[PDB]
Design goal:
homodimer, about 400 residues, alpha/beta, Aspartate Aminotransferase, domain 2, 2 domains, 7-stranded mixed sheet, two-stranded antiparallel sheet, 15 helices, 11 strands, about 40% helix, pyridoxal phosphate (chain B), Aspartate aminotransferase, cytoplasmic (chain B), Aminotransferase_I/II_large (chain B), aminotransferase (chain B)
Amino acid sequence: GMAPPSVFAEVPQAQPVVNLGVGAYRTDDCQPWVLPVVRKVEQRIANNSSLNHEYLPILGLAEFRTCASRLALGDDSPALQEKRVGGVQSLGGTGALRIGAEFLARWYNGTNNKDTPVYVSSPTWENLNGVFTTAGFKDIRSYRYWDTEKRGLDLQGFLSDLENAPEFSIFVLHACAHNPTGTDPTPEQWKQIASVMKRRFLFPFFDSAYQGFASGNLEKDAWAIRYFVSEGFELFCAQSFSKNFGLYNERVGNLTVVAKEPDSILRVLSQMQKIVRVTWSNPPAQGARIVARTLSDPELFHEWTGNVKTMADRILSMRSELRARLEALKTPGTWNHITDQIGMFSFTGLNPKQVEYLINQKHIYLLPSGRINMCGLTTKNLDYVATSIHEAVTKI
Amino acid sequence: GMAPPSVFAEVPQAQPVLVFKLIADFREDPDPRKVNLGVGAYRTDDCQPWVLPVVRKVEQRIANNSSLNHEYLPILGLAEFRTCASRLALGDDSPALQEKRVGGVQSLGGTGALRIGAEFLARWYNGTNNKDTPVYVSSPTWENLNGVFTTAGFKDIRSYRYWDTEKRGLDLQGFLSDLENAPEFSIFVLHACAHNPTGTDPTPEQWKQIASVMKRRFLFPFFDSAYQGFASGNLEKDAWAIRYFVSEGFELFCAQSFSKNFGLYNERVGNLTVVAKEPDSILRVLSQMQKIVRVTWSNPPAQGARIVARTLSDPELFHEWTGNVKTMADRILSMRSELRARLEALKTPGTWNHITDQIGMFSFTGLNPKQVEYLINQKHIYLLPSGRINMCGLTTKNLDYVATSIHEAVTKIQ
C-alpha cells in the first residue's frame, strides 16, 4: 500500500439498463418534431425583454399550475370551483410522481408510514418502482393488468387484486395510454375499478403522461381522472408535458392534488413546499412559461390541440396500417389489439423468441417484452415491418 | 350520515418561513424610505434584477437556431455543459482533469447538486447505506443545507464553529478543534468562497490549516460553490480552495451553482463535480449517480445549461461573461467600501472592518436581534434576525439613510 485508499474503491458499476424502441414522437421522416405552437411561443418569449430570471416560487409559476390543473380536471370542475385543488410544478412527470410519493410516505395513512402497500400495474412504467422505493415505501406490489393470452386487459385479475388490497393502499393508475401495453380500461371498466377503490379507501395516484397525445382529444383522455373526482375521491395526478407539448428536455410537469376541502390543500401544499425546497429548491421557468402561455391563449390552445391531434393521427394511421398489413398477410392470431390499443406504445404480443428473430435476422430493434413505439413505423418501412412480423410469427 | 374526514385531515400546516414574510412585510410597507436588505439575489443600483448582457445575447442565438430540438438530454446532462462547468471549477490545467479522474453531473441548481451528492454518499460512502456518518456544516450555514442532508437520510448532522460573534470573523481555533475531534471519514460541507450567510471566508493560509486536519483525519470535503467569480470578480481566486484541495490529493465533491454568477436563478443550472483518486472509479460513481437522478428528475432541463455551455465554450462570449461577473462583484465591493466608510465617519461604536473583509453579497453585520427589530420597526430597513444583509440592497441613494439608521441602532438599542 503506497497511497491512501479511494473512498470510491468499492462503488459498484450499476447494471446496464428500423428502431421501434424510441420513447418519443417521431415524424414519418424519423425526425423529432418541435410543435409549431411551441416554436411560436418560444419566439414570443425571446422577444419579451421584460422577463427576468429571478427564482420562481417554490411550488412554481402560478399561471402554469392553474392551467395545468385545469387541463386535467376540466375548466368547470366542481373541485376547482370549490377551491379544493392544489398544483405543484414539477420536473416532468417523474418529478411529480416523486414529490407525491415523498409526501405520502411522510403524511398519508399515518405519520412516516413506509408500510402502506403501493400497487403498480403488471407491467408498468419501468421507473415507477424506483421512484416509490426511493421515497421509502417498503411494500411495492403488482396488480394484474396485461393478459398475454387475450392481448388485452385482465379485468377480473385487476379487480381481484383491488378487492384483496389492504384498505388505504395506494394504486398508481395510468390515466390513459397505458405504458407499455397501450391497453386502457373502457369507461365501464373504470367505473368497476373506482367502485372497489371507493369501498376499500384505496388511494388513486394517477399518472397522466399522455393527455390528448393519447387519443387525439384532451377531454376524452382525462375522463377517468374527472370521473374519480366526480365520485368524491381525493387523489393525486402526476402530469407530464414532455410528450403532449414535445417539451421532453425542459422538464415540465405538475402534481395536481384534489382534497375534500380547501384547508387541506393549504396544509398539503405547505408540506409539498418543504419537500421541493430540499430536492430542486424551485422549478425551471422556460417550459412552464411555454405551457402557461399556450393554455391561457384560446388561439394558441386551439393551435396546440391541432398539433397534438396531428401526432395522435399519425400514430392512429400506423396502428390501422400495421393491422391491415398483418391481416392481409394471413398472419396467425388476432391483431385487433393493434388498433384497440391507445398511445405511442404497443405490446405486440410477440414472445422474446420472436423478438430475437426481428433483431438478429431482420434488424428491427424492439424490447424483449414485445413493446414497440408506433412512432418508429413509417409509410416507408411498414410493409417491411409487417412482412417481418409475419415471418416471426410463422417461422419462429 | 357524516362525510368521512379527508385523508389529509391530520397533515400539519408547516411552520412559516421567516424570510418569505419579511419580503412580504417589506412590500406592504408604505414608507418611502424603506430598504430591502433581505433580498436573496443580485440587484442593481436601481434596485432591479439584472439579466446579464451575455445571457440575453446567447438566448437570442438559441432562439434563432431552429435546428435545436427538445429531445431528452442524457440522464447526467448536456455533455458540453458538464465538461465546461467542471473545468471552470478546477481550472483548465487541473491535474485531475489531465488524469481523467473527474466526473460531472448536471443538476437542478446548486441545491440539486448537493442533494444528488448527499444521496450518493448515504448509499455508497463509508460503507453501504451508512446513514450514520457525521455530516458537519458551518455555524451558521446555508439555510436549506440541513434539510438536504437529512432528506438524503443522514441521521447525525453536526456543526463546526465558524462565525465568531465577538470578533466579527472566523473562529479559526474552534473550527480546527471541531475538525480535530470529528470522527474519521466525517463529511464536511465547505463553502468554497463567499460564505452564505456571513461573508466570512478562510484566507488561503487558514484553508491550508483546515486541509491539513482533513487530510490527516480522512475527512471528506463536500464543497458548495455557488458564487465563483461573483464573489471577487476573479474566477481563479474564487476557486483557489477547491483547487488547493485537489492539488493536495483529496477526493471531493463540489456542488456548483450557476444561479448567481450567470443570474440564471430560475433556469436551475448546477453541476456536481466529482474528483476521484483513480480514473476507473468515475464510471462507477456516475453509474450510481444516474440511478439517483433517474428517480428524482429523470434528466435535467436544457435551456440554462445550453446558455452556460455556449458561454463557457466560446472565447468571445466567455470574455463578455467575465466582464458581466466583474460588474456585479465590483458593485458589491463598492457598497461594502461605502457602507464601512460611512459607519466609520459616523464614529459608530465597534469595529467595522468585517464589512470590507467579508466577501460576496451576504454580510453578517454583527447587529443583535433587538437592533434588527429597531431597524425594521422604526427605520423600515428589512433584514434577517441574524443581522444578515445583502449588500445588493444598498444603493448610492440609500447608503446615507442605511448607515445613519445602523448608527442609531448601535448607539440607542441594547
